[PDB]
A paper describes a structure:
The malaria merozoite protein [name] ([name]) is critical for RBC invasion and is one of the most promising blood-stage vaccine candidates. [name] binds to RON2 through a surface exposed loop ([name]) to anchor the parasite to the host cell membrane prior to internalization into a parasitophorous vacuole. Here, three single-component [name]-[name] immunogens were designed that retain the structure of the two-component [name]-[name] complex: one structure-based design (SBD1) and two insertion fusions. We determined the X-ray crystal structures of SBD1 and insertion fusion immunogens 2 and 3 to resolutions of 1.80 Å, 1.85 Å, and 2.10 Å, respectively.
Additionally, we created insertion fusion immunogens by inserting [name] into an [name] loop proximal to the [name] binding site. Insertion fusion immunogens 2 and 3 were constructed by replacing several amino acids in the DIf loop of [name] with [name] and a flanking Gly/Ser linker. Immunogen 3 lacks only amino acids 265-KDESKRNS-272, retaining Cys263 and the disulfide bridge. The disordered DII loop was replaced with a Gly/Ser linker in both of these insertion fusion immunogens to prevent the potential displacement of the fused [name]. In contrast, insertion fusion immunogens 2 and 3 retained the [name] binding mode of the complex but displayed local distortions in loops near the vicinity of the insertion sites, resulting in Cα RMSDs of 0.381 over 232 C-alpha residues and 0.309 Å over 228 C-alpha residues, respectively. However, the IC50 values elicited by the insertion fusion immunogens 2 and 3 were 1.5-2-fold higher (i.e., less potent), and they were significantly different from that of the [name] DI-DII-[name] complex (P < 0.005). Similar to [name] alone, the insertion fusion immunogens 2 and 3 produced potent strain-specific responses but were ineffective in inducing a broad immune response, possibly due to the insertion of [name] in the DIf loop. This insertion results in a loss of strain-transcending functional activity, suggesting that either the local structural perturbations introduced by the insertion fusion disrupt strain-transcending epitopes or epitopes within the DIf loop contribute to protection breadth.
Numbering used by the authors: 7 to 159, 177 to 209, 219 to 295, 300 to 349
The structure:
Amino acid sequence: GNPWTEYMAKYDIEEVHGSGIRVDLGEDAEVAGTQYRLPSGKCPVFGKGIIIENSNTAFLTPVATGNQYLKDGGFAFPPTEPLMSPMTLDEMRHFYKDNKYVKNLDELTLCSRHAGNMIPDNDKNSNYKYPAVYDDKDKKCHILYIAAQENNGTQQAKDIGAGPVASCFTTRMSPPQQICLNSVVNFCFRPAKDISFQNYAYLSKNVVDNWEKVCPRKNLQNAKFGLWVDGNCEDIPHVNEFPAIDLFECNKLVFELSASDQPYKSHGKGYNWGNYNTETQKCEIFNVKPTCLINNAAYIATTALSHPIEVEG
């Protein structure tokens, strides 16, 4: 007897996303006998990036390679021959022009599939696929070489997402081609929604083709998450109030408290939702799936997955 069922489906994080948000390590994959953790969420995480502590290096900088003094880098794939990352949207469309399955794929899905094309060469039967970040401003897809997302002070490295030490990769696309790093690969960090990440989307290998329709992106203006009980949309019974100067800060707080696979698997369970009161500047965070919306002109409904700025009616 709930008329909101279909509308609210995209806010059922456990179902539509199915993995952690702050830290997504929801699946395991073997590469040459060794198990690794890797992101597996089905929805893009809008505005998510990685902040490297004691550094000005943007995390989309390619991972450091070589042995040079002051060697420094980020998380993205280093140069390869041919160059696989970063790749603009038009370069991806031209690169896959002979693959008729990539037609009509939107920017984010194409980027996730591009990142999933590289197989750690030591195991052709491996399901290991690297995650990616799409920059909607420059229209660039960055394949992440490091799948780890948090390290604030070996198996314990594997437990945070340390990927396989891989220098050569085989493409899943046919005809197969082997692509190796031009050099050998050799810090503490945390995920966050920083204002400088506003145009970024963090993408696991599992981002679904139809994310635009099933996943949350825009925050809901004049709306408040509730629970459907006996013909009425009741308030969430238990919330944690936090001060938030605007919607962005509230979305940032929801993201920090959201489902996390950091040491093991949340499967999407967590403080993933927030009702932001724009009059009292309060962020009301909760960990129960909402099943209806309340009409309240002072509220904006947000989720950890949602873009931290964009709103809709």
